[PDB]
A paper describes a structure:
PenL has been used as a model in exploring various evolutionary paths to substrate spectrum extension through amino acid substitutions, deletions, and duplications.
In contrast to the PenL-WT structure, in which every residue could be mapped, PenL-tTR10 and PenL-tTR11 both had a highly disordered region, where the mapping of the residues was not feasible due to high mobility. In PenL-tTR11, which has a longer tTR, nine residues in the upstream region of tTR11 were not mapped, in addition to the first repeat unit. In both PenL-tTR10 and PenL-tTR11, it appeared that the α10 helix structure (13 residues: 183–195) downstream of (in the case of PenL-tTR10) or overlapping (in the case of PenL-tTR11) the tTR required the second repeat unit of the tTR, instead of the first unit, to be in place in the protein backbone. Asn170 was found to be further dislocated in PenL-tTR11, resulting in a wider opening in the active site cavity. Furthermore, the side chain of Asp240 was rotated approximately 90°, moving away from the active site by 3.21 Å in PenL-tTR10 and by 2.89 Å in PenL-tTR11. The precise volume of the active site in PenL-tTR11 could not be determined in the same manner because a key residue, Asn170, had swung away from the cavity. In contrast, the interaction between W1 and Glu166 was lost in PenL-tTR11. In this case, Lys73 may act as an alternative general base.
Numbering used by the authors: 22 to 163, 193 to 258, 260 to 272, 274 to 311
Amino acid sequence: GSHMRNVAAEQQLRELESTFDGRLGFVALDTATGARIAHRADERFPFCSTFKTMLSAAVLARSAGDAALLQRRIPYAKRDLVRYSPITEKHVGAGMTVAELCAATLQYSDNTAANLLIALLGGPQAVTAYARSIGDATFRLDLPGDERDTTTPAAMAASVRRLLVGDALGTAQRAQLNAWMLGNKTGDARIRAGVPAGWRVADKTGTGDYGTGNDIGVAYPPDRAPIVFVVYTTMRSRNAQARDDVIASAARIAARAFV
């Protein structure tokens, strides 16, 4: 890699953004060197389901010195279900364990699972507090540039790096967060589609209206240092679809520059 290849990649990201009516927010970090490829890195974007990574980390932190928390079952009822709950809807009544809820919200993006975990922590402000505790002053869990439920690509990249690769969590908790995110089921068309097939990817997607299409995580090449990938996209038209292809293309541009 080189600075000039990174400069080239950043122009390619700008040219990629021109292909849709919106904004591309991107950070890729080669942890071998701290080399960063960035686009609109300091702008706020709606995070959508990508916050579930920060959620799950906060839950893992509560479990330090209390591993049995992960086996604790949380009951809930039908009235507790919110839209898009493909796992939790099958377990109304007795409910699911804390670990099951983390896996459901990370791997299937289950919304009720996220709400139950947010409640366990004491509310959305507890998730924001956790973010502050690992050095993230930007993340906020609470539309024409409403800052609620937003972060920046730079801030989320730093948090993803610290959580999955660095020391924000204890070693065992880092391992568990990675294991869950390596098993993601919702990201096949996003970062995973753009990086080499030989790289293991731990990722969390986010999708919303205004063509909001996000994917964050870490790629683990087989004989190199990990590369952090954060991709946020959002558009001017509320009706617009998220663009899996753009997310994949952004990751590809960075992967090409770093090899």
